[model samples]
Target: SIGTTKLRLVEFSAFLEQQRDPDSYNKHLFVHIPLLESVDIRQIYDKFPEKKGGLKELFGKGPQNAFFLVKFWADLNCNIQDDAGAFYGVTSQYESSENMTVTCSTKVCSFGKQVVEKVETEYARFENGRFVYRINRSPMCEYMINFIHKLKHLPEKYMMNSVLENFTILLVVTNRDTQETLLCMACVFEVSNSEHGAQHHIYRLVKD
Candidate 1:
């Protein structure tokens, strides 16, 4: 396998749960993030009176549920080398129903059992398989944060949480000064039981 590169930069997914109601401004409501164990509707309405009142009334009357799943991955673009060949990135995004006002708090968590500590945007060395950054240090950085913000806007006191917090990325080189490489990823899944809601999820791969 000399002179060959194993291609695979990242792997991930997201699942969304929503509710749809007729003649309502906040139709696409109800949200969840599996990583944040304590984050739920209860924790949400503690500070959001609007969602609390609305949900109390809606549940009493009954509402339809909707679900969406997004999955994506990334890899290198064949033919590469140099110190500049060391990094790759991936990002995910969530888009909800039209004209709906979604509200969520931007929270962070880990996809793995071990908590992922925040690291400097460019200073993190590959550990578990990858590193995460909140700022745009690379092309994929903006995409990743957009996904975070989009999820933060989910309705019904939802907390926009983070995943895959406890991992690191790597790039390697061969004995022949043949540059070697590697990368990182994130994943999620959503669920619900309604009929009149819709959501869109997206991801992108990058290198620098």
Candidate 2:
């Protein structure tokens, strides 16, 4: 279920962390590792109009399209040390909307007249290179782990997919010769392996 939700990014960051620090993160660190200290998903929206007369005219006004924003607040030193849970809310829209919960579990969110189903974001932030402040890297991380797992578990194949759609590995690996950070990222959208064994789709998450 990686990249299928808002939480997979947490695992992806952990994967990067382990690559950065092998002492705590081992080879089998790809499964069941919780890294989000605090996580939340909220929608960003603006005003729009509703029409009743013309083919492309608005008679009334309110918020229109909603852009979902998933915010992560945490200590990347491993896991959540104190923060308990994440928050999700569709915000700042008028017209009296009722929501049973404030979260991304709905897969879709609506406010005023906006019902957003599919959206892509590229916003990210980390406190001192170890905190959550971004959109979603879960897609890439999920891709990495799943591809690796498939290659590991199922029968070997000469090649997998032609292109990893909307997914890329963010590598935060240690330099082979230096202790200083080696900032790097994978730059291939189309690739295949001779025999499925950890194909090259990993991009650099952070330097070193």
Candidate 3:
């Protein structure tokens, strides 16, 4: 369990540092690649304090207890391809307009019901104005989740700190003025089992 323990400790340390001074350490992003278990990105985001006018505040409240975890196979470069494609360009620009819809879905395989309830519950209360962001007009361009199975099978640890589950998120953006749909992004997330025991969770932002 040392490996898992070490990773969690490192992530927590980083999380705490960000909480103390978000502006200083918020630029660097850490990407975790799971070997046998997946990490939760939303959980990682939750570790820090809420920004006054940043993305989290503008878009909505972030996922509760959302944060990121790193597995043994994680890439130090943090260049690993994320499930959500790079931020898609904004199609329409408008002020004081509400035309976005975000949705999340969790897959229930043989692993049983893991993310279904979590995803649904989160989306029901999901809001885009709780995050801090400089851009006032639809700050988030893209949102999604990614999932992957461990490449190398490993022995199960007793009292395991984390688990990996597969999940998907869909986002659709539309223009309110012309009633035209703009962009759609989908991503998969390997939600950490530590946050929500034995289940995958997915989240998304779309246009209504």
Winning model by lDDT? 3
Off-target runs (Cα >4 Å) in candidate 3 are 1-165, 190-208
Q: Which candidate leads in TM-score?
A: 3
Which lDDT tens digits does candidate 2 get at residues 60-132? 1211111112212111122212222211111111110111111121122112232322232222233443323
Tell me the TM-score of each prediction against the true structure: 0.19, 0.19, 0.23
lDDT of 3 by residue, 1-208 (tens): 1111111111111000122243433222212113333433344233222346222342344332222222322211222343332321112211222323322222222122223221221111213543111111122211212322232133453212244322222222223344333322222333232321322222333222
TM-score of 3: 0.23
Kindly report which residue stretches of model 1 are placed more than 4 angstroms away from their true locations once superposed: 1-69, 85-111, 114-134, 138-208
In order, how many clashes per candidate? Answer: 19, 16, 40
Could you arrange the candidates by TM-score from highest to lowest?
Answer: 3, 2, 1
Evaluated against the true structure, the overall lDDT of model 2 is 0.23
What is each predicted model's overall lDDT from 0 to 1?
0.25, 0.23, 0.25
